[PDB]
Fold OBCA, Oxalate Biosynthetic Component A.
Amino acid sequence: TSLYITAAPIGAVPKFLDPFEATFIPSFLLEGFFDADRCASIAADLKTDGWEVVPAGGRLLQVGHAQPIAHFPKPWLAALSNKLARRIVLQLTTYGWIVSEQGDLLWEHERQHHYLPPALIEAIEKESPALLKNMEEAGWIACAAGYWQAGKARSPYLPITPEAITEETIRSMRAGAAVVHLHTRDLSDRRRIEIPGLGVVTVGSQRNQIVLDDYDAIVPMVKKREPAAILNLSTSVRGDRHGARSKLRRAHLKFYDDVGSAPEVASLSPAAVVFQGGGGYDNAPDFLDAQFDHFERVGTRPEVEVFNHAIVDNATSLYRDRLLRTGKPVLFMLVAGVDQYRRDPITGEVEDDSLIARVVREEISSLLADESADSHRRAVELAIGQLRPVVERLRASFPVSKISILLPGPMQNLLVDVALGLGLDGIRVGLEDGLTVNDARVPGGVRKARGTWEQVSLVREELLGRGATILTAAQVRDMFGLGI
Ligand SMILES: O=C([O-])CC(=O)C(=O)O
Ligand SMILES: [Mg+2]
């Protein structure tokens, strides 16, 4: 098959981390400078924003970062188990350190306030006391108890503003992506917390939210630079119950006068999406009737986000004629590897409804953890066996269709094999789905991606190495009849 790459640069879940902000707040400074109650308040707000309580024993590397009241050579990391090295590499690249061509970690800035937690330091101390000593000579200093910003599910490169989203969209397209799937985030709750003997920390939910003013900016800013761009707007209200039938979910799917069209594509999920991990959202029949009516009217092609088997059942039965009406080829995205529930409306009980059955998915994760060529091949087999009948049901009901696949970060080594073996038409990558890339230069072999564009370049590379063709935006538009 020929394939198109979808870039997904933002999503609902990951958060931006400012790597130039403090990453550790000592207890004695917070508790002993504010009243015990506003100290409980600041703490709660830090905790809301993902900061975690830590005991003494951490290490802090700090330069030019306080007011009155930086390399990691490859042989250092190579001295450790793969697991320990990966932990360090992921933590430091989350903090904006980068991997050099020699496979060293480098911080390429003057100031920094970068902290490693006691559990990491303890593990280093056990595997290599000499490394801990080398680190302390390099300036890593022992810490008291306090609060740490791990940046769990965070990236210093996540774009959350119209300007940054535009720039990443364009870079992703230039790295090879034909389609860009967009979310916006609500940043109205941003607030600066000042801490004496430390400085300012900025908190905020970065909550997933359709922001109309953001799209009013993004759509023409993208189109001015790349008029061929195929924009796929998220209609999801993930994280935000109580908005599931709101017209807000199509208000961004208007004709944009500055651009002379409605968005080319937008996401549509024709059943409730109930993540096993929590945070899902309904898509009721009355709401969906309104969505389809609207997509058809403005000329936006739905991309059916196939989260679960309920969606497969519904798309191929009740909603089939409506999907045909919104134009061929009908577009599908397999949200593979993400555990899903279906809830019985009568009893309220849930059962597995994942595309890859959770029990099978758990086996796949175990196999990928082996890091052996045999295990990888078994993992691919299990994935294909689970996904094959889903793909065939979709192909049978929609002879003129295009089916892509995504996978969560930790399963992404399967992406190309699974997509090629299923005869899929596309593959999606981006910070929405995973924050990492492989990098053979660095011990442990994994690090934070420099951007969605980097993930796009790498998947494009792997595809070309197996004799696949990569379609451009101009080609996808023409062949899928989009933007009319
Ligand atoms: O974009 C969509 O339609 C779905 C999505 O990102 C999510 O709910 O995780
Ligand atoms: Mg999305």
